[PDB]
Design a protein around this ligand. Sequence first.
Ligand SMILES: *Cc1c(COP(=O)(O)O)cnc(C)c1O
Ligand SMILES: *Cc1c(COP(=O)(O)O)cnc(C)c1O
Lengths: 422, 420
Amino acid sequence: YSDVPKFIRDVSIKQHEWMRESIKLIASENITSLAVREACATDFMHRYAEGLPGKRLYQGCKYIDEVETLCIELSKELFKAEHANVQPTSGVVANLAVFFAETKPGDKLMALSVPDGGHISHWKVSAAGIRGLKVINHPFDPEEMNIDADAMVKKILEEKPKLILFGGSLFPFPHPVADAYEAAQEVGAKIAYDGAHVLGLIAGKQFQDPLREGAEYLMGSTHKTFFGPQGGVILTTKENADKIDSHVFPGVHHLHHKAGLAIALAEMLEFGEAYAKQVIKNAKALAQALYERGFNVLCEHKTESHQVIIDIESSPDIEFSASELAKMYEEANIILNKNLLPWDDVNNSDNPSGIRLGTQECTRLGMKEKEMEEIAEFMKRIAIDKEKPEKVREDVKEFAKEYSTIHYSFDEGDGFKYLRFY
Amino acid sequence: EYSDVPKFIRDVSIKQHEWMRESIKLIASENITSLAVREACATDFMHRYAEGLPGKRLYQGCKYIDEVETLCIELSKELFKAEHANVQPTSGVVANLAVFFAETKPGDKLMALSVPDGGHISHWKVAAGIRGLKVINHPFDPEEMNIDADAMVKKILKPKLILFGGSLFPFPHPVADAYEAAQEVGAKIAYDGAHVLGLIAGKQFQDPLREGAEYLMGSTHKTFFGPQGGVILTTKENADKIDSHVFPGVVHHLHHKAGLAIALAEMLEFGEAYAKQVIKNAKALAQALYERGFNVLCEHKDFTESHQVIIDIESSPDIEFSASELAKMYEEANIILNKNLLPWDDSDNPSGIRLGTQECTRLGMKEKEMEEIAEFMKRIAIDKEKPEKVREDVKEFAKEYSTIHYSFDEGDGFKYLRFY
Ligand SMILES: *Cc1c(COP(=O)(O)O)cnc(C)c1O
Ligand SMILES: *Cc1c(COP(=O)(O)O)cnc(C)c1O
C-alpha cells in the first residue's frame, strides 16, 4: 500500500526514458507538448462543464466557460467548420454522439471492414454497434489502397443507406467523400468523416478536405496526428448547433483535457502547415528508402498520409511473419504494431501479413528526411541481415535521446521530462 | 498571438488552483486529487494504447503496460474484495454504457432511478437510450428519501435489469430487497456506484456486491480521489464477459488509469479512516444546518446517510427566490454549490441543492470546521451580509490548511507545478 505509488512512479520514469531513448513509429501515437501536458495535470479535473458555456446548472464554472469557448472558437477557425463542440471525452464518444444525433435503427451504416482498413468503432461490440446496429462494408480495393467510389455509389444507390462514414485505420490516400455525395444526398444519407487518423494533416491543409468536398460532419480524436491530449472533438454545419450539442451530455467532460486541447490546438494553428507538410514529406521518402532496403512497402505507385503500409509475408529476403518482426522491433527500441492487411485470409490472429507505421511523433520530435532515411537502417537491420536485435539497442537508445525537444510549439522543452509533484 | 496562448491557460490554471485552494468547495460531484495521483497524469502514458487483459495488444510497445494494467486490476481486486474488475473504461458513462451493453437488447426493460426521481442521467435515454431502451422507474418515497422496497419487489413482478445509484443519492438503495426478486424473473442487477463507491471501498454506505449486485460500476471522480474514468467490479463468472464487452467497446486512457493505480493503492490503506470521518463530519454540517433553523430534506433522518446534504430552497424560511439564485450567491461568495431538482420539482431552477463534504474532508478538516462552514453560509442566508465582504471570511478558511490528508505524503493539494 505504502510503497506502490512510488513503484508506479518507477514504471513511469522507466516509461519516460524508454520513450526518449527509443524512436516511436506508430500510426495512432502522437506526442503532447509541455504546455498541454502540464495543463492536463491542473485542477480542472475538479469541476465539470455540465453542458455548454452559459448553460450550466452548476456553479464555479466561470473559467471553464472561457477555455471551452476559446477552443470551440479556435477549432471553428482552424478546420473552418460553422459549428464545433469539444465536449467528447474521446474519439469513440464522438462517434457514438454523432451517430446518436444523426442515426437510429433503420439500417445501413457504411464503413470499412476491419482488416480492410476499418477501425473498431462502427462494427458491433463498439460505437454504433452499441447504437446504429446495421453495418455494411465499404468497397475497398487492396491494390490501390483506397475506396473504389463506383461500387460505393452503387450500394448507396439501389440498396438505399441512411448514413455514410469516411476515414479509417488504413488510410494511405484520401477516400472519395466527393464522389459519394450525389447518391448519399439522393437517398437522404448523411455524410460524416472521422478525421482522427488524418486530423492533423487536414489542419495543415494537406491530404483530404472533407467539408469543402461536401461532408456534413467531421469528428475525431485529438490525440492522434493532432497535438492535443486524449479526447474527442466534433465539427459540423451550424444547423446541427442545437442537435449534436444536445446529443453530447447526455453523450458524455474532462476539462483539463479540453484546456490542453486548446493549447495544442493553437500550436496546430500557428505551426500546423509546416508540421503537416513536414509529416507527409517525412512519410513518403521513408517509404521509398524502406523500399530501397529490400522490404515490400505497399502502394509502390504512390502514400499521401502520415501512415505507411508494409506487407511482410509477400516481402522476400525476410520470410518472417508480421508479429515476428514486431516483437524483436519492440525490444530493439523501434516500436510499431501488429496489423491486418486487406489480403489477410481470416481474422483471428496474433500474426498478420504486415506492419503499419507513422511519422507524426518523430516529426514533432523534430526528425526530418535525413533522420528517417537513417530510420530505414535501424528498420532494415533486423529483417534483412538479421544481426542481433538487442545489440543495436545500445546504438538506438543513444540515438533518439538527442531530441528531447517538442517542435512546432511556442516553447522548446523536454517531451520525455518527468516532473515531481512530490 | 498564438504564441501567447500557452501562457494564457497556464495563468488561468495557476489561478484555477488559486481560486479553489482559497475557496470552500461544497459541490458533491467533485473531489481533490493527491500529488501522487496527479503526478501520473502528465506521463508519456497519454500517448499510448493497451488492449484488454492482461496485455493482449494488437499493437506493441506496451511491455511495461501489461504489468501496470494488471496492477490497477489487482488493486481493484484486493481492495473491493471483488472477484473481478476492469479499470479500462474511459469514463463513468463509458463504464455505465458498457454495462448496459453487456446484458441487454433494444427493448429490454431496465429498472433505474429517474432524474426527476433524484438520480443521475445516463440511466435514462437521450446515454441509456443508445442500445437498450424502455427504462422504468423505481418506486420512490418523497417523504423518506430512498427507494420503496415492497412496491419495488411487486413492480419487478418482469424486467431485464435493476439499477441503483444517482447524482442525488441521500440513502443506500435496497439491493437485498430486489436481490431474490431479480433472479426468478430472469433479470440481473447492476449497481451504479459512481457517486458512492469510494465510500464502499472504505466500507461505508452499503455493500452492493455482497448485497447481491452482479455488476458494480463507478466513477473515479465522485467520492474517489483520483483520475477521470470508470471502473467495473463484477463476479468472476463475468470476467472475460465484461473484459471483452469493453475493449472493442470503448477505445484506453493510460495516464489517468496510471493515476488510478495510486488512487486504489492509498484507497486500501486509508479508505476507512477517510470514509468514516466523511459522514461523521457531514452530519455536523447537517446538524448545524438545522440548528440554525433551516428547512432541509429528511429532517428526521439527519438529512442523509451519504455525503450529499439536500436543502429544499423552495418553501424555505428565507428565500422568495430561485434555488439557483442562492447557488450563484454562494458561488461568488466562493462557496461552490450545485442545483438539485427535487422530486417535487415539476428544469434548471430546482427546489433543492446538493452539498458534498469530500474536498473539505480529504483536506482533513473535522466537525467544528464544518460548523465554521455552516456559520459561513449563515453569514449570507440569515444576516444578509454582503457575499463579497463575506468572501474575505471565506478566504481565511480553506486557504489556511490547503494540504490534503488521507493519501500518503501530505503536500499542498492545489500546489502548481511549472513544466517548462
Ligand atoms: C483512433 C480512433 C479512436 C481511438 O480511441 P479514442 O476513443 O479516440 O481514445 C477512436 N475512434 C476512432 C474513430 C478512431 O479512429
Ligand atoms: C456521477 C455519475 C456518473 C458520472 O459519469 P461521468 O463520467 O462523470 O459523466 C455517471 N452515472 C451515474 C449514475 C452517476 O451518478
